[PDB]
């Protein structure tokens, strides 16, 4: 009744760690407690990721929570699938079916295509970033080929910031050659903030221009900066701030202090932090299910090292995976239900549009049902 | 005075190993000799790749030669950068800059864009495969954005060996429906062979079609099947069989036997194995230059541990990298010279066409000079 | 009882011999058994054919089964007519009336002419091989002279196999220069396979061309390579694979231990082998009927030599011939009925084309009724 | 000393036999006198032909002379090739190379094609019979395909004489309405005589009709019937009546009597008879050369039975073949010389076109040069 888990967090991650500890203290069952081993590192460094994973495996950790990017996803997936260690992450889902990886970030390709069809778009620009994967870009290109679209895929992830002014000015001047008024911003948070800021400077945020933020976090950024101007702005939001549970959680979250809980005294929580909260919840739920199933998973610092030749797995790993992937709970992100691969199934995505008054949801998207209008 | 190096090879790259051994015996001794440690492994498995790298590092190898895949390149780059151990490879160049990696494959984006400009194409399909990366697809996407092209990018990678015929057939009927005669194949040898077989079966290799084989191995595939069809078949070739060095090497190499040297009894040699030969030459020349400079590189003791904390790299790694990047030799691929990032500069790619009498070179593409017609 | 027969199988006809053995072991009963003398020989050698015929006559056989070509048909027919010994064959029917020769192959000239009239052709080519024969070419030339057609007869039997690629390529180039779109392939299985391979290689199987495989073995050749090209490919088939008897035959034929029965472990049976099986059936039926007629068919070793001077035949062979020509049974080729001259009558030939979903029987041809469309 | 030879003659070749005996008595030398054993049989009967051949072979005969038909050429050539026995014939050349056979009849396809080219023919009818093979038919069809001729080939051998009136009228009316004014008669002497008799009866010999008789016996048939008909008639001839040797032979032939020399009391002889005479001459010359070369091909005992398994070859037969294939003597049919295969070369064919004063040689044809006009 003393489960030791592992935690990998980026060097500079505060809100996600705060949500992690909030969930841990919220779901601290009197039957058992989860003791985490938190490692802060540069996730982009595959060597550092491997070092942390190997140290946690040597320490005897049953389940590992962490993050990965395009430069550190393959190593994590391979190590987990070989050593039979369950990995729970809020990061982007891997392209394919990688075992022993629990992916709680819902896919956005289907919702993005459904929203594009709803908006009746034929020609548009697609500004993407290579720091998260090109699966969305490939899906957009395939849909464009199928439905006879004219998509201009432009990468904005390979430019610095000192020459950003001139580079993006040239990019937008080239975009105005075709009179492009509809663009999609499939970029990270800092990248999309740069896009919106430089759009404001260049003066292309006037009416007629349509912008789509291709991420689950729409209300986290400076929506007020481009709120005025009359330009269409649309996006997605996994979290429903109007839900009773979300409001109850956010009240306590705002009442928490900032010293011991960095990035907490605010009325907006990042979707990564929300997914970390549901990750804590699902970990506790799976371990309660394992305890109630009367299954012995006794393990300690005796499994061995990381680079054992041959690397023999342990039989409890497949049972831990079955327990993790066979739960159905509800959190900030909504209904949670994974498949045999480790991806959510019956999730719901709330679509919001930005107006002068403020952000406002226009409908919801699901798997069985396409975009719905209220 | 023996120098120990490492070797990573995929399970199936027999011709590459044969070319490695041929280069080893050719450049056997001038003032010393090399001692490679070969470790055949699944190159796409990041865990196995890490295990091989760590075993070779513990063995105390001065340099490492091996391949990598799109899902195993980050591990090599990170480990080599953090351990100051060079990695000479004939695989696809990395998307960016990475120290301690000596990439031997010349870039193809510039030559492909120059060939498209020379052919004056406005609506060309792009059948890409997710093995060597999507960097060329991205580059052609920005080029299309900046040159007003109609690119129909289609992924032909995520298909199994059970509906290949149906998938390729339906793809080509779709291409006929939008009436698209210009197609670019950015796939490897086996994939382009499958595509060529399918297009022959459906009967679209007749006059009125144009295909570009976007790989350095234009003649490595079986072009005799589409030689008499009547459609343009362009491509790029890195080895010139009419060159003195290549002709002498082929005369020495075709007389061998397929028992001790698998895949070494043919008049043609794959560009990957050619780059293996030139990589053996480059390593030999670099170590010869190091010996001539009288720099002490021998270890003072054991190499250490792969996952040691902190990862301390030896002071001779920078010297090894500089010596490897400072060599300028002539090989099968042509002039060999590396810049500060480990890429290849001052190279030449011969553009060739498949006429009814055989593949005939029509010109060459350099970095300082664009496509030249001869 | 024990009745001995002869066998003139060629050197290389493994499937026909396997079908012969299967027919023997299936139609053999306790009433009597058949003892064959199988001699493998170069059937184009009239000397060897005469030697084998003389030896089998010297044994004292009652009927002879085997094959012949255009270079050995006259000697076989003359020997059988002079010696009053019957000869059942699946080879091409003789161009005339010949007694004591039972021919299991139905005529194709009438069906071919009816199909040409149905397709309403005016200017078409006719690729013939002198090795198979020229009776069909003579018939089509006479019809063209009587119906104002433009037939371009081409011989393809004189091409040596050492360089039989440029010959076909130049031939089809000449056909293109003559604007020839419709071609009739009247050749053997190997020759038609080579012609189809060359056609696909030169890209002459696309929509706009028409091909008629003028032989009863439409599906025996590898038709899948040209199925998806898009050009019309018609032909004739004598064996109906959807019939109950044929399906029951294949149910056993596909599981016949190919090592023990060469050319049997397949779902496709050559029309020649099917005719051999039906010939075994008809000879067994004829001998059973002769035994059930209370006729003395006792013959001892009094045959002597085949070149007796004068050559006095044995009168017991005319009853054998009458019984053989008085057989009305069903089989793989369909209804079997022989006229006074031994040529097959009351037969149906299935006319099929090659579609994307496989060959389909669109109708049947008969002597009494012209081509019928379904 | 003497050499036994064999003679195969059809039932009715009385003048052929008379010419053979005239040649024998004229070329009888005191050094050795041959003793031919003449056999009379239906040459179309393959069984009789091979029985006579085997009787000769058992007799111990070194060289065989005789005729063969379309239905016996194959067996004759096969037996001669297998038993290494030389065969000398005046019949049609074999449709292809065949060892141990001497063809004394010069080819006609080249001369006929040259005459057609010189006569500026682009549309005609090729009336042929299947008696001398289809080599000429194949040659004219290939030449028509090459030179864009609209030739209509009609077979007349299969049509029964009783019913060959209504069909004759129908086909001639078809030719008249289609302006098929030019015809070619590649038929035997009797068939062409019947054809010209029918033409005279029907009155289709009006000005414009250009009949070509494709045989060497132009003057053999009745040409005075169409001498004053006003219709062009062109033929070929191998024996020149103006030569001194031919004139002396025809005088010594006409001075003979019809009692002991049937059909020898006229001034008109057949080209086949002339070829028989030249065959006797070449046989005598070859035997004289063999005797002079001090080569004894004498056999101690009987050759045995032809049906012996295995066969019984002998190198003296090969030496005899080499002796025959290296003879260059003149004769009634002109110069005689054989190539390596056995065909006759170094020959000239005299072309005559019928006029009101009778046949007159309008030129000659050879192989070292095209057709020549005098
Ligand atoms: C392959 O087979 C198809 C059969 O579906 C051929 O289609 C044929 O196309 C011709 C076009 O000239 C049709 O002839 C036309 O018939 C109509 C109605 O009788 C008439 O009004 C036109 O003037 C013309 O004569 C023909 O009917 C049609 N076949 C059938 C069965 O309907 C196609 O041509 C074939 N491919 C080749 C290369 O021959
Ligand atoms: C029958 O024999 C007579 C006797 O020569 C032929 O008369 C002449 O034949 C020549 C060719 O042998 C003809 O020359 C041709 O003339 C045409 C123009 O009409 C020209 O285009 C050709 O290139 C060629 O030079 C010639 O006209 C013809 N008549 C005369 C008066 O000289 C005759 O052609 C033969 N055939 C028939 C069916 O009569
Ligand atoms: C921005 O949003 C507005 C309203 O939400 C859109 O306005 C209408 O959109 C419908 C949907 O296709 C069109 O049929 C109408 O013609 C639009 N009317 C007007 C006055 O715009 C608008 O299309 C959206 N996009 C842009 C670029 O403005
Ligand atoms: C295949 O090659 C031929 C000839 O190299 C191309 O034909 C040329 O097409 C261009 C179109 O840009 C015309 O301007 C030229 O006149 C054509 N002929 C020549 C000799 O250049 C053809 O376009 C190529 N592609 C295909 C699909 O056929
Ligand atoms: C032809 O064969 C069929 C099937 O065996 C039979 O029904 C039909 O009566 C036969 N025709 C004649 C004329 O006997």
Numbering used by the authors:
A (entry chain C), B (entry chain D), C (entry chain B), D (entry chain A): 10 to 383
Tell me what the authors wrote about this structure, in their words.
AMPA glutamate receptors (AMPARs) are ion channel tetramers that mediate the majority of fast excitatory synaptic transmission. They are composed of four subunits (GluA1–GluA4); the GluA2 subunit dominates AMPAR function throughout the forebrain.
We chose pH 8.0 to ensure strict alkaline conditions for our structural studies and note that the GluA2–TARPγ2 kinetics at pH 8.0 matched that at pH 7.4, used in the functional studies above. As already apparent in the two-dimensional (2D) class averages, the signal encompassing the NTD tier was diffuse at low pH but was well defined throughout the receptor at pH 8.0. At pH 8.0, the BD chains were spaced apart by ~55 Å (center of mass (COM) distance) throughout the classes, while the BD distances ranged widely at pH 5.5; some NTD dimers adopted an upright conformation with a ruptured BD interface (class 31), while either one or both dimers bent toward the LBD tier in other classes (classes 19, 23 and 37), resulting in a range of COM distances between the BD chains (70–93 Å).
